[PDB]
Amino acid sequence: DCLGDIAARDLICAQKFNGLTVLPPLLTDEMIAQYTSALLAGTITSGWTF
């Protein structure tokens, strides 16, 4: 029944009949992007001091 974006609604239908499920990761990709941006800004502005 279509696929809205990647994980917009998805009907929570990662299930496939005979007991086989896929679990979502703890950290969404936005948090990882924020982590990388923080590390990169820190290394540009402060060097290795931070």
């Binding site: 239908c13 299930q15 496939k16 009949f17």
Partner: protein
């Protein structure tokens, strides 16, 4: 359905079955669509939670 058993939610679908084909199948040998023997309509099968 005509000797084909299972369990799940039946819903209306928009598949295009050939005139002689009876039931569809996924890429993992699982059924996903069935012809209704009395009235020729395509029913999709989705497992309940």
């Amino acid at each position: 359905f005509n000797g084909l058993t299972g369990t799940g939610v039946l819903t209306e679908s928009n598949k295009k079955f050939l005139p002689f084909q009876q039931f569809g199948r996924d890429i993992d040998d699982t059924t996903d669509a069935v012809r209704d023997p009395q009235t020729l309509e395509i029913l999709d099968i989705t497992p309940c939670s």
